[PDB]
Amino acid sequence: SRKLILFIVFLALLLDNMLLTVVVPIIPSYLYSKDLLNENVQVGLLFASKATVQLITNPFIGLLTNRIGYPIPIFAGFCIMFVSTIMFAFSSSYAFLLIARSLQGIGSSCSSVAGMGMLASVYTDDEERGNVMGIALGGLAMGVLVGPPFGSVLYEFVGKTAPFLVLAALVLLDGAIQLFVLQPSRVQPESQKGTPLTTLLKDPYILIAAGSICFANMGIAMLEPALPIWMMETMCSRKWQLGVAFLPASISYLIGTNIFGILAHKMGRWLCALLGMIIVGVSILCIPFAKNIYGLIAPNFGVGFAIGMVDSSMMPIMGYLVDLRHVSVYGSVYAIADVAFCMGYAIGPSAGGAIAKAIGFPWLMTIIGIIDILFAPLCFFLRSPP
Numbered sequence: 001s002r003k004l005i006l007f008i009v010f011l012a013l014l015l016d017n018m019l020l021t022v023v024v025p026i027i028p029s030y031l032y033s034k035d036l037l038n039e040n041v042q043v044g045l046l047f048a049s050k051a052t053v054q055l056i057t058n059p060f061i062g063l064l065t066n067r068i069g070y071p072i073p074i075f076a077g078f079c080i081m082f083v084s085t086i087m088f089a090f091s092s093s094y095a096f097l098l099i100a101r102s103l104q105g106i107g108s109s110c111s112s113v114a115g116m117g118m119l120a121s122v123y124t125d126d127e128e129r130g131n132v133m134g135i136a137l138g139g140l141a142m143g144v145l146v147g148p149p150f151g152s153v154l155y156e157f158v159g160k161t162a163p164f165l166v167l168a169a170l171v172l173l174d175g176a177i178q179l180f181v182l183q184p185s186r187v188q189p190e191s192q193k194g195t196p197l198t199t200l201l202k203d204p205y206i207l208i209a210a211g212s213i214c215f216a217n218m219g220i221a222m223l224e225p226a227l228p229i230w231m232m233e234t235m236c237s238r239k240w241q242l243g244v245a246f247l248p249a250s251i252s253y254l255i256g257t258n259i260f261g262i263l264a265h266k267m268g269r270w271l272c273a274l275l276g277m278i279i280v281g282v283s284i285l286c287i288p289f290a291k292n293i294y295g296l297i298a299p300n301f302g303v304g305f306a307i308g309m310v311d312s313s314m315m316p317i318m319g320y321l322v323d324l325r326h327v328s329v330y331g332s333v334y335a336i337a338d339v340a341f342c343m344g345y346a347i348g349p350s351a352g353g354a355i356a357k358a359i360g361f362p363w364l365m366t367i368i369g370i371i372d373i374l375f376a377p378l379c380f381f382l383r384s385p386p
């Protein structure tokens, strides 16, 4: 009866991602007080901060779960996430909003690394692990799909402080379940010590598996903060777009994540990721020819699809490689996965702008595209000798 544990991770990934998306319709409210890709720095400093902290706290957890087990960290991540929500409920200043974003990120990392660790440690059969993760990655898409709509409508219809408090209730409810299934009472270590991080980072077959996740995420991040939505002006026609502009990413991501998780193992898992990167590159190369906001609807759909097509396939491969070559402790490797997932958001907002100053912003897209395709063929060396 391991399935129920999986359920927990699903929630741990849904609510966590609902909070970051929920603040989307509230960002312009206290932000103010001709090209389509005008860049804003105030949003940029809001996008990286959370990740800039999550990247720092990612490795420190990988060792921790080797000494005090998986449950306790998860519980801590819940607690922190609740605190963050509360801080949000009374956050009235931009600085205070940045402080809440930092703690949130901490909690996020805790949940992501510990959850995945356990989720790989419980499902030891390779195909099973594959599909289970392919399911657990869906929670990210659901959080991206529900957090922007759920909030906006309620905020205006009921109250400015409603969308946090109500959501906080669910978080509190979630805590109850964590106390019934995980039982963080007794702290115990693992059986055998894990492989030192250095050693893993000295391996090419892991480096690639981390580069594949970084490139695609880096491309999507370089686009998100530079959108006409954040621009607050009376000349703006309507805010209907705000709260739905993140649909074409999440809707495509859920299908790709649950449709290849069981399918990739049928074909070559190496083949699934290659085509993924190539299709993400093709979709990004059409972003320059937008000329209108609706012109961004077609690319993002593919973008997200391919993102899923990569993440579903790459996430298990990390655990399979550690089992085939190193000690069977999964706590540290997935930490690497997570940092490879986050670096794109950690470095996008600044570098992007810097290039936008050097050359035109469409030129930046024409570059991050080609690199992706250039990185595509070397996913062939995914078959491993040991």
Ligand SMILES: COc1cc2c(cc1OC)[C@H]1CC(=O)[C@H](CC(C)C)CN1CC2
Residues within 6 Å of the ligand: 020, 021, 023, 024, 047, 050, 051, 140, 141, 144, 220, 224, 246, 249, 250, 253, 303, 304, 307, 345
């Ligand atoms: C307002 O803050 C944030 C807003 C958003 C994101 C991050 C934010 O903060 C880092 C990412 C999250 C995903 O994983 C999404 C990945 C999709 C491709 C599935 C993309 N987007 C959405 C919006």
